[PDB]
Amino acid sequence: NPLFQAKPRSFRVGGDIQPKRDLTRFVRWPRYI
RNA sequence: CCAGUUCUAAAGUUAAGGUCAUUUAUUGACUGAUUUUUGCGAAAGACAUGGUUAGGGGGGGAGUUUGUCUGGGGCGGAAUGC
Ligand SMILES: [Mg+2]
Ligand SMILES: [Mg+2]
Ligand SMILES: [Mg+2]
């Protein structure tokens, strides 16, 4: 509407570039933990 | 259930936008990009694998042996024991 108009992004496969998400479970951790 | 990327040797990153505050600045906070989960993912699973024993197999490889007499030695024969 104003010069500020919305610009969508599609994260379904084969689409725009995936964003940063919480990978905590999938992290590589040193032996000890 | 299907699709939100199939004519096209391109472009696709420090983002938009919404909601709420401050502050009037790409400032702050949520959302934009759902949730839960004391297995990154998959394949086998007490099987395989490893350990020690037991029976096979093994000139690939090690070691060694392969009598004596003897008209040279060998082939033959024993005048090798009686
Ligand atoms: Mg054996
Ligand atoms: Mg030999
Ligand atoms: Mg005789």
- Record the resolution, in angstroms: 3.5
- Is the Cβ–Cβ distance between A9 and A3 less than 8 Å? no
Strand B nucleotides within a 7 Å radius of protein CB atoms: 4-5, 12-13, 15-18, 33-34, 37, 39-40
Asked how this structure was determined, the answer is X-ray
CB of A1 lies under 7 Å from some atom of strand B: yes
Side chain identity at residue A28, one-letter code: R
- Residue A31 CA and nucleotide B16 C1' are separated, in Å, by 42
Q: What is the DSSP letter of A32?
A: T
Determine the Cα–Cα distance for residues A28 and A9; give it in Å rounded to an integer.
29
The region, left, alpha or beta by phi > 0 then psi within -120 to 50, assigned to residue A14 is left
CB of A30 lies under 7 Å from some atom of strand B: no
